[PDB]
Design a protein around this ligand. Structure first.
Ligand SMILES: NCc1ccc(I)cc1
Length: 245
């Protein structure tokens, strides 16, 4: 997250931190995700497509720091890793950038809700907020495009939804942006998602309910004039989510 503010998992208790185990034992951060039910985390396919084996992954809930064991956290293996069969990528845009992880602890358990572990509601189909609505994004991704390191402490920021019509302008993204994607940005382009935020939640308030409106997917750079963050539009994937969970 470029700009914004530090936070803790209490302020986004559905946030899942996803890591990969390397061949020589090391463990590195991969991507964010969101707990949509006790056994299911939703994320982005592009996070996993290079290493698509479920046994490589570790998922944490209730975790506010990248490399420290937050009191109350839970650790899970990935029982199933479900990538979207119509995924594609070109130089910039990911299509159908959505993935499900069925989580299972070593004791064979799913998530147990606490002050630091809660689910996020899915949106109603084809029901998104209007352009200009402020939404929040959360993640452990880079604080500056040029950074080598990820922040140790979780971050969040606010971005505004951009109309498809605006996002499809040539000087924005043209036809790289589809109706299954949502664009969001800061009016001054000063805050955004960035590398390492992929898979994490774009959350908006619809009818007084926090709702998983988007999943962090792609962008040209980060916090860059005329280059919004692009998000998988969750409200256009409900049958896929329901059918795979
Ligand atoms: N600013 C949106 C964005 C940029 C790069 C990645 I990787 C993911 C999301």
């Amino acid at each position: 997250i470029i700009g914004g503010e530090f936070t803790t998992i209490e302020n986004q208790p559905w946030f899942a931190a996803i890591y990969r185990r390397h061949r020589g034992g090391s463990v590195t951060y991969v991507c964010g995700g969101s707990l949509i039910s006790p056994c299911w985390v939703i994320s982005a396919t592009h996070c996993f497509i290079d290493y698509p084996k479920k046994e490589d992954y570790i998922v944490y809930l209730g975790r506010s720091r990248l490399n420290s064991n937050t009191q109350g956290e839970m650790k899970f293996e990935v029982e199933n890793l479900i990538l979207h069969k119509d995924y594609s990528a070109d130089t910039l845009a990911h299509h159908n950038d959505i993935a499900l992880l069925k989580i299972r602890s070593k004791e064979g358990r799913c998530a147990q809700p606490s002050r630091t572990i809660q689910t996020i509601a899915l949106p109603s189909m084809y029901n998104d907020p209007q352009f200009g609505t402020s939404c929040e994004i959360t993640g452990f991704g880079k604080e500056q495009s040029t950074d080598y390191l990820y922040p140790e402490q979780l971050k969040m920021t606010v971005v505004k939804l951009i109309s498809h019509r605006e996002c499809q302008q040539p000087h924005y993204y043209g036809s790289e942006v589809t109706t299954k994607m949502l664009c969001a940005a800061d009016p001054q382009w000063k805050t955004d998602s960035c590398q390492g935020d992929s898979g994490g939640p774009l959350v908006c308030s619809l009818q007084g309910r926090m709702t998983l409106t988007g999943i962090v997917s792609w962008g040209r750079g980060c916090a860059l004039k005329d280059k919004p963050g692009v998000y998988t539009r969750v409200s256009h994937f409900l049958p896929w989510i329901r059918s795979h969970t």
